[PDB]
Write a protein that binds this ligand. Structure first.
Ligand SMILES: C[As](C)(=O)[O-]
Ligand SMILES: [Ca+2]
Ligand SMILES: [Ca+2]
Lengths: 6, 696
């Protein structure tokens, strides 16, 4: 559940 | 023009490993609370900031990353009763927000917003909705520790139940179909399996399983789609192997209030078993038993000796996961040469019905249940930010339809391409790698190159979307490589085993050989290659720069495991001895001493013919408070590398900087957008500097 695909 | 701080050595610390004397002059860095260790951190922080201010492209990277990340993201929806639940992020929120809706394209309502709590320092890692859709059980971190507290909200009005469950880590909350409560797996104030009735205090929770005799055994659990069986899985280490205990809930005289009488269907650690479906007592399992590429098997619990292949093991492809869907069907997710293939089959006969091969990238997040006729899943890729696909198996089983589609602002994917090629390793084995770059580039050796890898623990590295990677590609004229080296599980268990324990070194040889290929093919050149990796991937970076520093210009190891002699002594290092060995045993020490990063730092310029070589520019990244990979690993390596290569000599040929980027007041987990961007921007600015690469 990562916040954003950085 | 660089000023390394003084770092005390304790020349009295020496250990004898089976007749071999090993000094540990930086033993004192293993206490993260001593003021010396804090002063160490403060000095390295000062050094790093000093070096990073020389890296003038950080500001430019940071902005382009932000701009490229700033697009809305709807996660894969799942259904409970008549409601649909999914994660959302408008683009640059610290953490994703959990949302609920009555209709798929109806008005979202916010169920829980982690950004309101502690500035969104951490997001939801446990989230679980009851069968009736009335209750949402979720995990909140209290501080920088790994410990979670489980709270429960009513979905109708977003009001909390008084229930508070402490002492939880990674457990999920498994709801019974009566909606009276859920199973979970906490630790005592020796993991346990408990059931919690809604409206009661944690003290009242029913105990289902412990094993005081085997404290290190840990648990996962599950309940069947029909709600009749509770399944408890017991695991040993980070091995892909587990037990299977089944509890039949229909035969309990007084529900769970009685209390346990498990049918121990699998009472050993020989193979992995994951329950996919059942029809009464007839179960379908995914297993790796006699099948390193896995398969589905079927067994009746009333006659548990007899197991029967339903879908046999493929000679070539890993059966990575399986899902019962649309009452009587299966979706199988095969991994074929590191590319996904979905198959649709009959549940009963196991017969193939349809076969959908997938473009380079990754499908995952299939959360549909057996009663659902509409399957959703997520696809991503180097050049594809994120599509949620839908497949309605009832009305249109053949076609995948786009349900949500992310768009990166101001980015034309058609200027770039991604190829998969296979390259030979030292022992002849072919190694798949993915290579991403601008279309039509000249293979003239000129391009800066970033190579990423992991190589361990059965983990499959897939070419997913990274926004900062696009920046690297577009604005640094770069070439990205992802290497599927051994130790992973990409070709099943034999690919895992060929890169672990005594054969760990093959993992490093595979990575080195990928770099050798990228050089010989004309993509890049010696010294213009950057490598990056995290955890076991950090071990990968650090071992490879010890062994072939000549090859690399820049190296970035993230929360890496660098003291392979002592790793097992700390926190949860004991669960990695499956893959690594343990220095407690002589045969295994002999593997480890050879690649253990902190015990293999040597001046490359002191070897014949190698006078012109130095270690690459090296950034070592960690939190000050990592409880998984304790930062003493990263610190001790830094100290060692700094001493051996810099501060032990009056005017050393090691001119490439060696620093640590140290994240303050951070945990291993949960990583807020922005915090995360900051880190990546720092490491890419550094990289651009080390490779002498201009901006575009
Ligand atoms: C968290 As690990 C050391 O298994 O990559
Ligand atoms: Ca400046
Ligand atoms: Ca250089």
């Amino acid at each position: 559940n990562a916040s954003a695909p950085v | 023009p660089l000023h390394y701080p003084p770092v005390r050595r304790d020349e009295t610390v020496v250990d004898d490993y089976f007749g071999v004397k090993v000094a540990d002059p930086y033993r004192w860095l293993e206490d993260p609370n001593s003021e010396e260790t804090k002063e160490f951190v403060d000095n390295q922080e000062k050094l790093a900031n000093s070096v990073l201010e020389e890296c003038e492209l950080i500001d430019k990277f940071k902005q382009k990353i932000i701009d490229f990340v700033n697009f809305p993201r709807c996660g894969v929806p799942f259904r409970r009763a008549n409601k649909y639940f999914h994660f959302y992020n408008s683009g640059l929120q610290a953490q994703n927000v959990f949302q609920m809706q009555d209709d798929l394209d109806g008005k979202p309502e916010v169920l829980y917003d982690p950004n309101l709590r502690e500035g969104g320092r951490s997001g939801l890692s446990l989230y679980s909705v009851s069968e009736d859709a009335k209750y949402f059980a979720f995990g909140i971190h209290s501080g920088l520790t790994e410990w979670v507290t489980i709270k429960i909200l009513k979905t109708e009005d977003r009001s909390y139940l008084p229930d508070t469950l402490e002492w939880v880590k990674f457990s999920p909350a498994i709801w019974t179909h009566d909606n009276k409560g859920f199973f979970y797996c906490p630790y005592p104030p020796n993991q346990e399996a408990r059931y919690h009735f809604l409206g009661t205090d944690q003290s009242e929770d029913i105990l289902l399983w412990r094993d005081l005799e085997n404290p290190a055994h840990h648990l996962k659990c599950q309940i069947t789609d029909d709600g009749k069986y509770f399944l408890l899985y017991i695991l040993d280490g980070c091995d892909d192997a587990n037990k299977v205990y089944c509890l039949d809930l229909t035969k309990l005289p007084n529900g769970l209030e009685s209390f346990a009488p498990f049918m121990k269907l699998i009472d050993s650690f020989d193979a992995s078993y994951t329950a996919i479906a059942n029809d009464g007592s007839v179960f379908t399992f995914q297993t790796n038993k006699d099948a390193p590429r896995k398969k589905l098997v079927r067994v009746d619990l009333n006659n548990p000796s007899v197991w029967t292949d339903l879908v046999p093991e493929s000679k070539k492809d890993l059966l990575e996961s399986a899902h019962a869907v649309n009452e009587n069907q299966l979706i199988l997710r095969y991994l074929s040469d590191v590319k996904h293939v979905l198959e649709i089959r009959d549940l009963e006969s196991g017969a193939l019905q349809h076969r959908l091969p997938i473009d380079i990238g990754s499908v995952d997040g299939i959360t549909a249940r057996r009663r659902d006729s509409v399957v959703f899943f997520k696809f991503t890729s180097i050049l594809t930010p994120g599509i949620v696909y839908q497949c309605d198996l009832k009305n249109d089983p053949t076609q995948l339809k786009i349900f949500r589609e992310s768009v990166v602002p101001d980015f034309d994917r058609s200027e770039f391409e991604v190829k998969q090629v296979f390259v030979p390793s030292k022992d002849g084995t072919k190694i798949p790698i993915f290579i991403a770059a601008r279309k039509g580039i000249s293979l003239d050796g000129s391009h800066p190159c970033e190579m990423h890898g992991y190589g361990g623990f059965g983990i499959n590295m897939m070419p997913t979307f990274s926004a900062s990677r696009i920046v690297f590609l577009k604005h640094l004229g770069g070439v990205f490589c992802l290497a599927n080296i051994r130790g992973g599980g990409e070709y099943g268990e034999e690919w895992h085993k060929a890169g672990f324990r005594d054969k760990k070194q093959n993992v490093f040889d595979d990575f080195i050989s990928a770099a050798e290929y990228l050089i010989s093919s004309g993509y890049t050149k010696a010294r213009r290659v950057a490598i990056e990796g995290g955890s076991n991937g950090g071990l990968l970076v650090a071992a490879c720069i010890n062994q072939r520093p000549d090859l690399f210009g820049c190296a970035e190891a993230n929360c890496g495991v660098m003291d392979m002699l002592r790793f097992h002594k700390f926190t949860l290092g004991y669960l990695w001895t499956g893959d690594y060995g343990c220095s407690d045993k002589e045969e295994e020490f002999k593997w480890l001493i050879k690649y253990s990063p902190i015990h293999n730092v040597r001046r490359p310029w002191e070897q014949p013919g190698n006078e012109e070589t130095q270690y690459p520019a090296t950034m070592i990244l960690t939190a000050d408070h990592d409880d998984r990979v304790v930062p003493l690993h990263s610190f001790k390596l830094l100290a060692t590398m700094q001493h051996v290569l810099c501060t032990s000599l009056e005017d050393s040929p090691q001119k490439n900087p060696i620093i640590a980027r140290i994240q303050r007041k951070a945990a291993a987990y949960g990583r807020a957008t922005m915090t995360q961007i900051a880190e990546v921007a720092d490491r890419y600015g550094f990289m651009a500097k080390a490779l002498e690469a201009p901006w575009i």
